[PDB]
Every structure is written in C-alpha cells, then in structure tokens.
Amino acid sequence: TAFNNGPVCRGDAVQLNTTTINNALYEWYSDAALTNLISTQQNPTVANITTDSTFYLVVTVNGCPSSAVATTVTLHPTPATPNIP
Amino acid sequence: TAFNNGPVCRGDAVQLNTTTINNALYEWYSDAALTNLISTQQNPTVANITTDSTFYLVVTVNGCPSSAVATTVTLHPTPATPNIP
C-alpha cells in the first residue's frame, strides 16, 4: 500500500511512504505506464508539487513484483488576496 | 492492544501506539467496518482531531490477523472566553 503526506502547499515537497518489508526492492514511478522511475527509497520525497498528482509504487520481493499502487497528492486550496486600504 | 495519547486540543494531532511484535504487519483503520485504511505504521500520527473519534488496530502475524482493537481519542474541554473591560 502507499500513503502520502497530507495536502501540500504549492511550492512544497511531499514525503511518500510505504510498508517496510524485509529485503524488498521498492520502485516509485511518475506514471501509470511505469516507464519513468523516480526513486527506489522506501520513503522518498518529491519536490515542487504544484498540482494534484499521482505516484505509483511497485514492490518486488523474492523476485516477484507487485501490481502498482497509486497514491494521490492533493494541493491545499490557495488563500485569498489580503484586504488593504 | 492499542493506546492513544492523552486528550488532545481541537486542532492537534494524536500519536497512536501499539505493542512491538517481531515481523508483524500493523494496520490502522478509521472505521469499525475496517474498509478505510489510514496507516501501516506501528506508531502513526493522526492530524486534526477536532472531535472524539476512534481508531481500529488489526495486527497480522504469521499470516493470521487479529480481531480489531478500538481506541478512543478524547478531546480536551474547550477553555472559556477571557474577561475584558
């Protein structure tokens, strides 16, 4: 399974998280097609999330890769322009 | 078994806790039906507890899941409006 941090500010970074499995290989992808690898860390951080986006996790254990797990990173609604004289 | 932190302020977060079991899988759910998974960490933190709420823990060891354990997070009674001239 995979989890994100809560909704993120437009210029901030999101730490992605998953379950620790002994001697597992983790692969995080930027796309459903699983062609663009971002990271192999268990808990990678993805910078500059300026839009809602998804990440896909594949975990390989014993030489047997899992299906991909999608997570969605939400962006926090932009605050209103302040009131000045 | 599962434990919470003490009563929490309305906008704060609560760390939930359980017993360490070697190579156990932990699953925390937001509901009794066990359909909405929140986290797989041993000691996850749940943000924005604005109301009394419960969490359910299921632990799987040796491929054998436990029954769910409920915990209740209490919210600290809101302080009174200050006295001003």
Side-chain angles (χ1 to χ4, degrees):
Chain A
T1 62
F3 304 97
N4 301 323
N5 203 327
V8 65
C9 299
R10 188 180 299 277
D12 286 342
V14 178
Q15 184 173 32
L16 305 175
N17 301 292
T18 190
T19 296
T20 299
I21 300 169
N22 288 322
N23 300 322
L25 173 66
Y26 298 90
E27 293 179 345
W28 294 87
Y29 294 86
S30 71
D31 194 277
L34 306 178
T35 62
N36 184 352
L37 182 67
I38 297 168
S39 177
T40 59
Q41 295 177 308
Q42 183 184 271
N43 304 88
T45 299
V46 291
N48 200 36
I49 306 302
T50 63
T51 187
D52 292 347
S53 68
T54 61
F55 298 90
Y56 297 84
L57 173 67
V58 177
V59 179
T60 300
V61 300
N62 303 319
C64 299
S66 71
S67 66
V69 178
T71 70
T72 301
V73 178
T74 297
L75 177 63
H76 260 317
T78 299
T81 304
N83 296 325
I84 300 297
Chain B
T1 62
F3 304 97
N4 301 323
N5 203 327
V8 65
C9 299
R10 188 180 299 277
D12 286 342
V14 178
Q15 184 173 31
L16 305 175
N17 300 293
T18 190
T19 296
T20 298
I21 300 169
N22 288 322
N23 300 322
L25 173 66
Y26 298 90
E27 293 179 345
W28 294 87
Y29 294 86
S30 71
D31 194 277
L34 306 178
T35 62
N36 184 352
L37 182 67
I38 297 168
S39 177
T40 59
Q41 295 177 308
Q42 183 184 271
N43 304 88
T45 299
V46 291
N48 200 36
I49 306 302
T50 63
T51 187
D52 292 347
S53 68
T54 61
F55 298 90
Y56 297 84
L57 173 67
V58 177
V59 179
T60 300
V61 300
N62 303 319
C64 299
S66 71
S67 67
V69 179
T71 70
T72 301
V73 178
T74 297
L75 177 63
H76 260 317
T78 299
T81 304
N83 295 326
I84 300 297

